[PDB]
Design a binder for this molecule. Structure first.
Ligand code: FMN
Length: 134
């Protein structure tokens, strides 16, 4: 709740989605998200965030995000995302399930952090090794 306030003042790139609506659409996007991705609000409001994914996005990573959403818990992962002009960037992605006072999930918050090639090489390597383990 103030978590979201904290992201605003930290000027982060994030969206909030509403899983009560079909296909878990975006109901808010920060200015930082618009700047990073090059989309406008009209393009993304009421839409699922998968438009950030492209042909070279690791599907194992997308799957990890899917399970956390199905279970209503938190995770992070580094994957390839795509801007509106089709240019790419490395995204250290974080997602949190927001629960109400009764413990029911009301929202998801996805924070996008653009990261370097150097950083991404290490983390995706570690992710590949984790996947190879299981
Ligand atoms: C709050 C939120 C933020 C999201 N942000 C991203 C993102 O930055 N990058 C990404 O590749 N997927 C993002 N997604 C994941 C997709 O929306 C989708 O949940 C994922 O691709 C798995 O579900 P699907 O198989 O139905 O596409 C986000 C999802 C949520 C709920």
């Amino acid at each position: 709740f103030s978590f979201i306030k904290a992201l605003q003042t930290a000027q982060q790139n994030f969206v909030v989605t509403d899983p009560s609506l079909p296909d878990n659409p975006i109901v808010y996007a920060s200015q930082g998200f618009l700047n990073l991705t090059g989309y406008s609000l009209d393009q993304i409001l009421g839409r699922n965030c998968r438009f950030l994914q492209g042909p070279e996005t690791d599907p194992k990573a997308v799957e990890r995000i899917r399970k956390a959403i199905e279970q209503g818990n938190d995770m992070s992962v580094c994957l390839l995302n795509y801007r509106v002009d089709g240019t790419t960037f490395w995204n250290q992605f974080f997602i949190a399930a927001l629960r109400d006072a009764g413990g029911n999930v009301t929202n998801f918050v996805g924070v996008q952090c653009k990261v370097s090639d150097q950083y991404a090489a290490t983390v995706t390597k570690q992710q590949e090794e984790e996947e190879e383990a299981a």
